[PDB]
């Protein structure tokens, strides 16, 4: 009867409406969020800020989208209903039509974008900076055994013996103080690892060739040491 | 005496074995092109780091070897009082460190080279993905844009079949959808965690067509019982 085609499409409308307004404010809120989000430049935080955009995709995402879609539906069906019985159109609130809806679908997907695009920003140069971090000390200090094993394997000395193991024996003791800065170049290396960095534009050195370039230089400095004062003992 | 005698033949041996070790090593790494599939390329990086710890090391541990000995055998003849031993030509200390020098710069370009492979190589399983991702969302969404459409003015049966025949075109969609999650699937096996040249991942596709389709049933439905009121 016509009294219960009235109440059931007026139910409908009541339906329509309060739903359209709760995931109006719905997307509101977690647009606003996403805006909020002010990228780390820490590398494990940044990773988490990006796995986060991960639990709106899985969760509210398919939640508001699905929404959006029943609702279009629910608007055709009241006006479906409204025309078969020569009722006047159902017009909804202002700003809460499914067109309107579908609107708000769009502006969060924008900014869901937007902030996933500046979250792969951050996590690039957080990498970028865990690199440097390793190859600036790397560099230098590769450089500087560098300079101790052109010293150690120079030839061309015509200073008496004793000048040259003296001069030998200090610059060791020099070299040896590059063992000390070694330990934090192996943490900025080990740092690199932990976010799975695996190239290094910026240096031609890993933390074990420099570790190996110490040890060898250090003992062709002992051994040189050693053979020439077995030459000052057979005078 | 006869201990500097094989200390000079033992360098000599030495400084050789080197020399040529390095040229073959040179020549295999200047010999190397990058694969363009990442499995390979991936290889092919690996076996550069195990060049890193492997004969690069042992290259490295050899020339500074033999420059000590080359020291101790004229240490041990100006001792003596005796001339200085100067290497064959190519042999002396100064000559294997350019050899390390040469190696080195090998091992640097190759490096590199395989890491542009590797990076174009990521570029393009992400354009493997995105592109027919990118097409099938679009061709979707014109489905969205029609059922969500409300203006037809046309006898109920006639929207009943035109939703149909509209729906029947979009259900040829999903054949289309495996081969895009094999591509997504490619991209997680090199572990790829962005893509730039799209805004959706294959869930976002399945379920787009799941509720599009959906929505189209669901109209269907309320249509057809409006024809039998």
């Given at each position: 009867?016509?009294?219960?085609?009235?109440?059931?499409?007026?139910?409908?409308?009541?339906?329509?409406?309060?739903?359209?307004?709760?995931?109006?404010?719905?997307?509101?809120?977690?647009?606003?969020?996403?805006?909020?989000?002010?990228p780390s430049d820490e590398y494990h935080q940044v990773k988490e800020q990006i796995?986060?955009?991960?639990?709106?995709?899985?969760?509210?995402?398919?939640?508001?989208?699905?929404?959006?879609?029943?609702?279009?539906?629910?608007?055709?069906?009241?006006?479906?209903?409204?025309?078969?019985?020569?009722?006047?159109?159902?017009?909804?609130?202002?700003?809460?039509?499914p067109k309107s809806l579908e609107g708000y679908i769009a502006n969060i997907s924008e900014a869901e974008?937007?902030?996933?695009?500046?979250?792969?920003?951050?996590?690039?140069?957080?990498?970028?900076?865990?690199?440097?971090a390793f190859a600036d000390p790397a560099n230098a200090t590769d450089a500087k055994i560098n300079e101790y094993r052109t010293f150690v394997t120079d030839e061309t000395?015509?200073?008496?013996?004793?000048?040259?193991?003296?001069?030998?024996?200090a610059k060791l003791?020099?070299?040896?103080?590059?063992?000390?800065?070694?330990?934090?170049?192996?943490?900025?290396?080990?740092?690199c690892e932990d976010a799975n960095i695996e190239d290094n534009e910026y240096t031609d050195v890993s933390f074990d060739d420099l570790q190996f370039n110490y040890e060898q230089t250090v003992s062709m400095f002992e051994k040189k040491i050693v053979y020439i004062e077995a030459q000052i003992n057979e005078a």
């Open positions: 009867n016509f009294l219960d085609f009235l109440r059931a499409t007026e139910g409908m409308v009541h339906d329509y409406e309060q739903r359209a307004q709760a995931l109006k404010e719905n997307i509101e809120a977690a647009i606003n969020k996403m805006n909020g989000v002010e796995n986060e955009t991960k639990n709106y995709r899985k969760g509210d995402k398919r939640a508001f989208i699905k929404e959006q879609g029943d609702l279009a539906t629910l608007f055709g069906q009241i006006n479906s209903k409204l025309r078969g019985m020569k009722r006047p159109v159902y017009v909804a609130p202002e700003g809460l039509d974008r937007a902030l996933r695009s500046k979250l792969n920003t951050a996590m690039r140069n957080c990498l970028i900076a865990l690199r440097k000395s015509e200073a008496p013996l004793e000048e040259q193991v003296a001069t030998l024996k003791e020099e070299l040896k103080q590059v063992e000390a800065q070694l330990p934090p170049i192996e943490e900025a290396e080990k740092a």
